[PDB]
Write an enzyme that holds these catalytic residues in place. Structure first.
Site, PDB file in Angstrom:
ATOM      1  N   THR A 173      -2.773  73.372 -40.581  1.00  0.00           N
ATOM      2  CA  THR A 173      -2.972  74.849 -40.717  1.00  0.00           C
ATOM      3  C   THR A 173      -4.119  75.169 -41.685  1.00  0.00           C
ATOM      4  OG1 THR A 173      -0.628  75.320 -40.223  1.00  0.00           O
ATOM      5  CG2 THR A 173      -2.052  77.050 -41.082  1.00  0.00           C
TER       6      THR A 173
ATOM      7  N   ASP B  94      -7.597  77.776 -36.630  1.00  0.00           N
ATOM      8  CA  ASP B  94      -7.549  76.754 -35.660  1.00  0.00           C
ATOM      9  C   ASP B  94      -6.456  76.974 -34.630  1.00  0.00           C
ATOM     10  OD1 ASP B  94      -5.615  75.488 -37.749  1.00  0.00           O
ATOM     11  OD2 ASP B  94      -5.243  74.298 -36.047  1.00  0.00           O
TER      12      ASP B  94
ATOM     13  N   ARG C  27      -4.861  74.424 -32.708  1.00  0.00           N
ATOM     14  CA  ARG C  27      -3.976  73.293 -32.656  1.00  0.00           C
ATOM     15  C   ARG C  27      -2.709  73.609 -33.357  1.00  0.00           C
ATOM     16  NH1 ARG C  27      -5.884  67.260 -34.455  1.00  0.00           N
ATOM     17  NH2 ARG C  27      -6.006  66.996 -32.076  1.00  0.00           N
TER      18      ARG C  27
ATOM     19  N   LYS D 264      -3.235  80.994 -33.058  1.00  0.00           N
ATOM     20  CA  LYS D 264      -2.401  81.359 -34.151  1.00  0.00           C
ATOM     21  C   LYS D 264      -2.611  82.832 -34.605  1.00  0.00           C
ATOM     22  CE  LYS D 264      -2.345  76.793 -36.713  1.00  0.00           C
ATOM     23  NZ  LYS D 264      -1.135  76.318 -36.085  1.00  0.00           N
TER      24      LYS D 264
ATOM     25  N   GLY E 198       3.583  79.089 -42.102  1.00  0.00           N
ATOM     26  CA  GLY E 198       4.957  78.986 -42.527  1.00  0.00           C
ATOM     27  C   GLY E 198       5.726  78.344 -41.423  1.00  0.00           C
TER      28      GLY E 198
ATOM     29  N   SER F 154      -2.195  74.608 -45.336  1.00  0.00           N
ATOM     30  CA  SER F 154      -2.123  73.440 -46.217  1.00  0.00           C
ATOM     31  C   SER F 154      -3.469  72.863 -46.403  1.00  0.00           C
ATOM     32  CB  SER F 154      -1.302  72.174 -45.712  1.00  0.00           C
ATOM     33  OG  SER F 154      -1.716  71.723 -44.415  1.00  0.00           O
TER      34      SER F 154
ATOM     35  N   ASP G 102      -7.242  67.604 -42.783  1.00  0.00           N
ATOM     36  CA  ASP G 102      -5.810  67.976 -42.583  1.00  0.00           C
ATOM     37  C   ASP G 102      -5.587  67.631 -41.148  1.00  0.00           C
ATOM     38  OD1 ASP G 102      -3.607  69.750 -44.140  1.00  0.00           O
ATOM     39  OD2 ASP G 102      -3.448  70.087 -41.956  1.00  0.00           O
TER      40      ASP G 102
ATOM     41  N   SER H  40      -4.813  70.520 -38.593  1.00  0.00           N
ATOM     42  CA  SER H  40      -5.890  71.381 -38.285  1.00  0.00           C
ATOM     43  C   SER H  40      -6.632  70.656 -37.199  1.00  0.00           C
ATOM     44  CB  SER H  40      -6.772  71.819 -39.453  1.00  0.00           C
ATOM     45  OG  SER H  40      -7.814  72.689 -39.026  1.00  0.00           O
TER      46      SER H  40
END
Lengths: 226, 243, 204, 233, 241, 196, 229, 125
Positions: A1, A17, A19, A33, A47, A129, A166, A169
């Site tokens: 994220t 992103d 994914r 998203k 979250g 994150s 990440d 992501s």
């Protein structure tokens, strides 16, 4: 994220992103998203996934109700307020943490909202994150009064730092640019690192490899009146 | 009309017939006056002595409220006593929450909403008392009077009951002599004369004069009944001039 | 053992050309004790198909629940249940128990009747609306199944090809699962009609 | 004026006098006579115990409410009951929580209020019963009259119910004598007997019918009958 | 008639009760005036001067509901107060709910909806007051919304209320046609007040003292009442006519 | 987190830092926590940001109603309404709220509402992480009815030492000056006072 | 469930021949941090009663406010009252106890330890104790917490029993309280130098002596020792 | 004790499934679809006019001119586009979707026609 928010002069640009992961397995290759509270109030959600969709749907309606009731496009802060109280009640078990962005007749805004109930304003914010990775670019290059054009590069490049560091992501970057006085320009799939590649070898099975023990044909179709 | 047989119907008068009746009852109560002074207020009331079997100064009409709000009322005794009691309960909530004594106009507003609902509804019988109240709060001295209508305004003089006519005339001297209001000690003496001349309209029974005050300079801005020698003296002033 | 994985079970769906498939194994176990060789869990409301994995008593509960709600839909609105509306409907319910969620994995498969558009969507315990149109997997052995479905599946499959592909995906995961092994059924769902095939596979 | 206005508590006559109120008063006139009086140190109530016939026992109309409290009724029997149990309740709350015996005056303000609530309300009963309440607090002896109106009045002496004329006159005359008399239970109790004879058409003077209560700074609330009231009869 | 009393539909299907409220709101005889300047919203109401038993100042018809929003009340006073609560209250609650100051338009809509609920309530008798909100609105600038006792509501360029409303309207109508706009002339906030004072005097024919008026002025982020003596500064040139 | 208010001759000056950290990460360095509840009653927030923020909105609306019906709130009045919610919910909600507001009659008033929730008027008040660090420094340096410029300086002197000792204190020193003049913002960069 | 956050300290008190004496230092500590060094813990109600409240400051104000209302309530109805049904230390006392036990029954007390001192309408001296669990007793000498152990024993040397009450003059009693408070400052850390003193005497009413100081600190023993060196 | 809604509706609308649709909802709480309906004082007049001049199979463009004329019988003192509120529910407007760049979402079906727009439609009559 990784989710970013960058104010620019004549608006604001939000990116995140596509994914999606459920655990360490990739659930969806693409699924945006970025969710619509209203046409010019967009937010991107982090979250617990379930909660983020649900809260947007429930609150969505009240915002829509507001709009029509008042014959006037609600304030960006109005969405902010209503969102904050909801979460606060449950003391954050409902775990939606969101970047709330939008443009309205008052002007351009960029806020963050957490499940505990804390708010901030930022010129440029990052959430998820991959907040740590995206910000680092932002803080090293950002200057006062970026152009729209420049905001859009700085922004996308920042998502790339998230992607590579990440695991969650990934894939296409989707962008919604909300500008004063204009319909939000949703730039679907602004960025593409790479996509699914066909396997070297074919996995086509000649018919009759599956065995057929019995067969019963179902008719969901309308039995004759005759 | 049928508007007198169904409470809380909009009359073509614009005021329901019953509420009007309710006002009329204020008059059947005793001459009660209030005098706004320069650093306090005086409340004064004619309390008819019914008989020798009645007991001096024990069912006093003057009632204490808070610790700075002096209160007296004219009309249905039962109705008013419940209203004064309601009033303390409201003040109580105000003190706990905001940790401060109630401003006198705050007190008027709160009472105002209570009356209003109880006339707008069929279920609850209109109130039929006029209440003189006030004292010395933070914004100093004020005299307000609360109509059973639910209007209230600031005043510099109040007079109600039957003998109000006599009373208003004597109150006009106060304003001319002093825009300030008369000195709180001297106004005790004027107040007795006003009640006494207005007892020549209510002479048919005996009476007792009861005065109280809340004054910053002679009471320290707390409520007190004026008793004893000041009270007996006041009667003489009055007796001397109406002779 | 969390209540879902006491009863496990698997569902695997794929879209093909002008068709969808929804398929499952037939093993019902509670722990070490397998309870019935033959046991269904894919039901249909009109042309829309729903298989449901997870805790068995909650499966039964939800199936009734949805049957109730979908009846009203077709009667009041005076049109057949679509997959699109139906995906939202499954989602709404699932969320109402946030705390202590239904211990289930629902899977929608059906074809929109207004354009032939093949539609599949999945769900987890908590009401996630998964929009993968390639494939959807669910159960305990979901992880296994994903790994089959990602290599074998190819964009654009002829109906008769799609039938072989999904069957091998279901079968080999079955034998690498504990709580599966006994028999199989494939629904191949086309706009014109439904062919339902009980396969022959190895049995413990 | 049957029905229409003044037919229910809410509806006003133009003048604004409820006709019903006067009727509730009439209930007291129909009621058992009782004479109450006091001195500073004692409060003495005398009530004639009504009866239907010879075999029916002479029925107490003086009710002990509490150790240091009691009341007598003239008027409608159901109403007196709902009110009396309430008297008891309030006195208990104060003793428990705030230590003190409930003062007689302060209990009366509450009682007033309770009567006014039924006058505000759609429906319900304004209490149609009048009560002479006597009590011993830290202000000493008191005597109140509770009206169907609600109003509570501290009076040296009063009488309610049937032929009140003879005892009221008698009290006016002997006013000065029983208020000076203190420190003498027995003499107050005599004054009170003498008083109730005037009201009555000499219906009875029997020990059997007159029941005398006394509470003060000396005696607790005690009910006196037969022999104890034969001293003074 | 019973037909007069029923809160439910009358045989006519247009309530008698509603016509009655309209009677009521002219018992007090307050002629009020509200106009829209360029950047200022002027509200004027007769301040009656009673006997000395009441203070004159205290007597008022102009009330500060919230920031920017003022309210002039026409029709009986105890009902005025009742209404007043609900409007002050909602402005606060909206600010809590929504985290921004309530606009004018939205407060009036709320109160029309409450008005209509009143005739659906059997016990309740409909409030028989006029609520006219004036403000310098957030978006729209000078705004006038007049609300009827029935619950009808409509916006205004300018308005007057009272039994003598008719005379004032005419002057304001012709003025606006000559000026060829809807705003009272002059950017300056001060002289628009004076053009309002003057136009009130003309129509009614009665010169009013500072004693006989009260002048509430809307600026950006406050509604506030002028001093007694401020009024006089305008009045003096005008007064010799 | 370090917040403060200090009375002086002509009123009171509210000061705060602005650096709020989540774990080691600085989540926002420019966080606003001078929050207007009234025109000249402002509050300073520390503890949980979520909770103090909710509290402050509830009080805010309450004082608006109080202004309209009952007349203008004084600083004391506000302190009570903050207290009562803090007290009943002392345990669920964490709150370190300084309610300070300025009357022309009583100059600057400062009242601190600790977690426990009680009203205590003080000539000056300190709270948050950084207050422990400066507790003695301020007592040594306290001066009653001082010049307005000395008041500015003091806040600056004390807070620089808070930053040194505490690495979660820092960012712009914002101020709300309450004197009869009105409401005035001052903003002082780290760059100035840290080297001073 | 209320748990202690802000803290208070010992209250010492005694009966003597014509009244009673209550004294307490002026502190509102936040634990080890002595945050507030002058929060007056003795709250007079009239001249009749002075109610000493230890433990949380937060609840000291909660009760303070209940008492403020209680004065007004008493004054409502029969206001010619002044010594009749008008408040007594016992009236006050009984009210607090009853509320307190109901608070404990909802497993969430007001967390204080309280001594009511005052003089009844009879003239009799009143000293009665009540605390958060709801332990009720009266004793010729009473002290709380640290006071219980340390300033109580000296009080007992004097007023050992009922008969000793008359012998104890208000003057001895005054020496006694004052001397005792010095000891508590010496060997308890909580205790400040500042203290307040309140005397409820039947004849002289309330004599409230504020802001007295503890002096004659012992360092004569400090200088003798240097320990190991 | 709660009177019927004082109002009878037409709810005109567009949805995908059942295309353009036209309704009346009565304050009783019975509803009916129509080909054409009109309500108010001039209901008699209007309904007959629509019949004569039009049928469903005719296009929309014709009906707007027709509807203006019909309403024009009603009142002739002013017919200016200020006092006349005219709207269509028809085709989508992908402009008024307001979050362009996504095409699949239907735009608003409803578009309210301004006074100027009315006046254009008056010179087409």
């Amino acid at each position: 994220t990784t989710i970013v928010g960058v104010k620019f002069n004549n608006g604001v640009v939000i990116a995140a992103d596509t994914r999606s992961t459920q655990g360490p397995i990739v659930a969806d290759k693409n699924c945006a998203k970025l969710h619509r509270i209203s046409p010019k109030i967009w937010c991107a959600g982090a979250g617990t996934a379930a909660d983020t969709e649900a809260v947007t749907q429930l609150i969505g309606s009240n915002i829509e109700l507001h709009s029509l009731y008042t014959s006037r496009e609600p304030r960006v802060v109005s969405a902010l307020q209503m969102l904050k109280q909801h979460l606060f009640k449950y003391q954050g078990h409902i775990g939606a943490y969101l970047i709330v962005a939008g443009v309205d007749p008052t002007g351009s805004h960029l806020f963050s909202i957490h499940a505990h109930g804390s708010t901030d304003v930022g010129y440029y914010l990052s959430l998820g994150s991959g907040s740590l990775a995206a910000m680092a670019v932002l803080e090293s290059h950002w200057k006062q009064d970026l152009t729209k054009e420049e905001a859009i590069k700085l922004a996308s490049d920042a998502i790339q730092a998230g992607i590579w560091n990440d695991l969650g992501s990934g894939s296409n970057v989707d962008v919604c640019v909300m500008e004063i006085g204009k319909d939000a320009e949703y730039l679907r799939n602004y960025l593409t690192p790479n996509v699914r590649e066909e396997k070297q070898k074919s996995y086509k099975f000649p018919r009759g490899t599956t065995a057929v023990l019995k067969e019963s044909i179902v008719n969901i179709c309308d039995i004759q009146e005759e | 009309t049928g508007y007198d047989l169904s409470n809380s119907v909009f009359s073509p008068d614009g005021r329901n017939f019953q509420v009007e009746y309710a006002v009329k009852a204020v008059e059947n109560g005793t001459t009660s006056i209030g005098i706004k002074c320069n650093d306090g207020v005086v409340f004064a009331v004619e309390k008819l002595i019914t008989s020798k079997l009645l007991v001096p100064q024990k069912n006093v009409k003057i009632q204490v409220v808070d610790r700075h709000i002096g209160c007296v009322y004219s009309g249905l005794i039962p109705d008013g006593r419940h209203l004064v009691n309601r009033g303390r309960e409201e003040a109580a909530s105000f003190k706990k929450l905001y940790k401060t004594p109630i401003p006198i106009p705050a007190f008027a507003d709160r009472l105002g909403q209570y009356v209003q609902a109880h006339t707008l509804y069929n279920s609850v019988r209109p109130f039929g008392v006029s209440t003189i109240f006030g004292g010395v709060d933070k914004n100093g001295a004020h005299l307000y009077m609360l109509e059973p209508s639910g209007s209230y305004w600031g005043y510099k003089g109040a007079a109600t009951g039957k003998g109000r006519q006599s009373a208003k005339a004597e109150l006009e001297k106060l304003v001319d002599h002093h825009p300030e209001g008369l000195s709180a000690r001297e106004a005790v003496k004027q107040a007795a004369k006003i009640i006494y001349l207005a007892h020549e309209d209510n002479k048919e029974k005996d009476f007792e004069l009861e005065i109280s005050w809340c004054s910053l300079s002679e009471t320290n801005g707390l409520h007190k009944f004026v008793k004893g020698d000041l009270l007996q003296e006041a009667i003489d002033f009055a007796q001397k001039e109406i002779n | 053992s969390d209540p879902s994985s006491i009863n496990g079970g698997i569902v695997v769906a794929m879209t093909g050309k002008d068709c969808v498939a929804i398929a499952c194994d037939l093993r019902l176990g509670s722990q070490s004790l397998g309870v019935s060789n033959k046991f269904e869990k894919i039901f249909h409301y009109g042309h829309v198909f729903l298989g449901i994995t997870g805790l068995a008593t909650d499966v039964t509960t939800l199936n009734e629940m949805f049957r109730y709600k979908t009846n009203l839909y077709k009667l009041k609105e005076e049109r057949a249940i679509e997959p699109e509306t139906f995906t939202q409907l499954v989602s709404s319910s699932l969320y109402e128990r946030r705390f202590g969620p239904y211990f289930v994995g629902p899977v929608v498969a059906g074809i929109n009747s207004k354009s032939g558009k093949p539609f599949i969507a999945g769900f987890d315990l908590i009401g996630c609306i998964d929009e993968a149109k390639d494939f959807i997997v669910s159960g305990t052995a979901s992880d296994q199944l994903f790994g089959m479905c990602e290599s074998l599946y190819e964009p654009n499959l002829e109906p008769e090809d799609l039938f072989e592909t999904i069957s091998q995906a279901l079968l080999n995961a079955a034998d690498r699962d504990a709580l599966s092994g006994w028999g199989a059924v494939v629904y191949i769902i086309k706009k014109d009609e439904v062919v339902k095939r009980y396969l022959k596979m190895r049995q413990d | 004026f049957r029905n229409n206005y003044d037919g229910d508590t809410v509806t006003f006559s133009p003048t604004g006098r409820l006709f019903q109120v006067e009727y509730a008063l009439e209930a007291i006139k129909q009621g058992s006579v009782t004479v109450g009086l006091r001195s500073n140190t004692h409060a003495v109530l005398v009530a004639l115990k009504r009866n239907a016939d010879e075999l029916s026992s002479y029925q107490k109309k003086i009710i002990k409410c509490d150790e240091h409290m009691g009341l007598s009724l003239a008027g409608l029997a159901p109403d007196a009951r709902v009110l009396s149990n309430y008297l008891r309740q309030q006195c208990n709350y104060s003793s428990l929580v705030f230590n003190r015996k409930l003062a007689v005056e302060r209990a009366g303000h509450l009682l007033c209020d309770k009567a006014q609530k039924n006058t505000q309300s759609y429906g319900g009963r304004p209490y149609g019963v009048g009560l002479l309440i006597i009590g011993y607090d830290k202000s000493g002896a008191h005597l109140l009259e509770f009206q169907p109106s609600g109003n509570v009045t501290e009076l040296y002496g009063t009488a309610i119910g049937a032929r009140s004329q003879g005892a009221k006159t008698y009290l006016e005359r002997t006013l000065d004598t029983f208020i000076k008399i203190d420190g003498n239970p027995d003499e107050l109790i005599k004054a009170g007997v003498e008083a109730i004879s005037q009201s009555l058409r000499d219906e009875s003077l029997t020990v059997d019918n007159l029941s005398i209560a006394i509470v003060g700074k000396d005696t607790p609330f005690t009910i006196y009958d037969g022999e104890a009231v034969a001293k003074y009869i | 008639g019973y037909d007069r009393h029923i809160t439910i539909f009358s045989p006519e299907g247009r309530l008698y009760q509603v016509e009655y409220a309209f009677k009521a709101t002219n018992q007090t005889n307050i002629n009020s005036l509200a106009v829209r300047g360029k950047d200022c919203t002027v509200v004027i109401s007769q301040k009656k001067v009673p006997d000395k038993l009441l203070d004159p100042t205290t007597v008022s018809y102009i009330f500060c509901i919230s920031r920017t929003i003022g309210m002039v009340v026409n029709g009986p006073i105890p009902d005025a107060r009742n209404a007043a609560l609900r409007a002050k209250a909602e402005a606060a609650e909206f600010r809590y709910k929504y985290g921004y100051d309530m606009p004018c338009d939205v407060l009036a809509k709320r109160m029309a909806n409450l008005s209509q609920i009143y005739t659906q309530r059997a016990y309740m008798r409909p409030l028989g007051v006029i609520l006219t909100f004036v403000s310098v609105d957030e978006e729209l600038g000078p705004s006038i919304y007049k609300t009827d006792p029935a619950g009808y509501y409509v916006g205004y360029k300018a308005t007057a209320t009272g039994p003598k409303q008719q005379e004032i309207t005419t002057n304001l109508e012709n003025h606006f046609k000559k000026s060829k706009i809807d705003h009272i002339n002059e950017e300056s906030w001060e002289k628009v007040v004076e053009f309002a004072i003057t136009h009130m005097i003309d129509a009614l024919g009665t010169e009013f003292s500072k004693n006989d008026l009260e002048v509430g002025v809307a600026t950006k982020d406050k509604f506030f009442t002028l001093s007694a003596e401020n009024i006089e500064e305008r009045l003096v040139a005008i007064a010799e006519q | 987190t370090s917040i403060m208010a200090v009375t002086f001759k002509d009123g009171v000056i509210l000061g705060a830092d602005s650096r709020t950290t989540t774990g080691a990460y600085i989540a926002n360095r420019v966080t606003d926590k001078l929050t207007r509840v009234h025109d000249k009653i402002w509050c300073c927030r520390s503890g949980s940001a979520a909770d103090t923020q909710a509290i402050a909105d509830i009080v805010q609306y309450h004082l608006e109603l109080y202004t309209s019906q009952y007349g203008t709130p004084s600083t004391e009045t506000a302190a009570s309404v903050f207290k009562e919610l803090c007290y009943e919910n002392k345990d669920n909600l964490t709150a370190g709220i300084i309610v300070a507001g300025y009357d022309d009659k009583n100059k600057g008033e400062v009242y601190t509402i600790p977690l426990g929730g009680s009203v205590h008027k003080l000539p000056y008040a300190i709270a948050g992480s950084g207050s422990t660090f400066i507790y003695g420094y301020c007592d040594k340096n306290f001066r009653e009815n001082m010049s307005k410029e000395e008041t500015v300086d003091f806040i600056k002197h004390s807070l620089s030492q808070a930053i040194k000792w505490d690495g979660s204190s820092g960012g712009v020193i914002r101020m709300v000056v309450l004197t009869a003049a009105g409401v005035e913002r001052l903003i002082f960069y780290p760059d100035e006072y840290e080297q001073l | 469930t209320q748990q202690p956050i802000v803290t208070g300290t010992s209250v010492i008190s005694m009966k003597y021949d014509n009244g009673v004496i209550i004294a307490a230092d002026n502190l509102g500590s936040y634990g080890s941090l002595l945050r507030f060094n002058g929060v007056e813990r003795l709250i007079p109600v009239g001249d009749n009663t002075v109610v000493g409240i230890s433990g949380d400051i937060s609840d000291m104000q909660h009760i303070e406010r209940l008492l403020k209302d209680l004065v007004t309530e008493n004054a409502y109805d029969n206001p010619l009252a002044d010594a009749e049904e008008a408040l007594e230390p016992s009236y006050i006392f009984e009210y607090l106890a009853t509320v307190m036990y109901q608070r404990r029954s909802k497993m969430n007390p007001l967390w204080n330890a309280i001594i009511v001192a005052g003089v009844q309408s009879n003239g009799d001296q009143f000293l009665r104790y009540v605390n958060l669990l709801g332990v009720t007793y009266s004793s010729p000498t009473l002290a709380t917490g640290f006071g219980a152990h340390m300033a109580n024993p000296l009080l007992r040397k004097v007023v050992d029993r009922e008969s000793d009450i008359p012998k104890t003059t208000v003057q001895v009693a005054e020496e006694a309280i004052v001397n005792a408070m010095r000891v508590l400052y010496y060997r308890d850390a909580r205790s400040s130098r500042n203290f307040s003193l309140a005397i409820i005497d039947k004849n002289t009413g309330l004599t409230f002596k504020k802001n007295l100081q503890v002096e004659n600190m012992k360092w004569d023993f400090a200088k003798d020792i240097k320990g190991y060196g | 004790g709660v009177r019927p809604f004082g109002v009878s509706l037409l709810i005109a609308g567009h949805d995908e499934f059942n295309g353009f649709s036209l309704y009346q909802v009565d304050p009783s709480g019975s509803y009916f679809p129509w080909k054409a309906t009109a309500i108010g004082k001039g209901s008699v007049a209007a309904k007959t006019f629509l019949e004569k001049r039009w049928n469903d199979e005719l296009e929309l463009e014709d009906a707007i001119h027709i509807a203006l004329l019909t309403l024009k019988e009603s009142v002739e003192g002013e017919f200016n586009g200020d006092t006349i509120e005219l709207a269509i529910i028809g085709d989508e407007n992908p402009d008024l979707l307001g979050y362009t760049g996504i095409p699949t979402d239907k735009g608003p079906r409803f578009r309210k026609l301004t006074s100027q727009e009315i006046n254009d439609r008056l010179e087409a009559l």
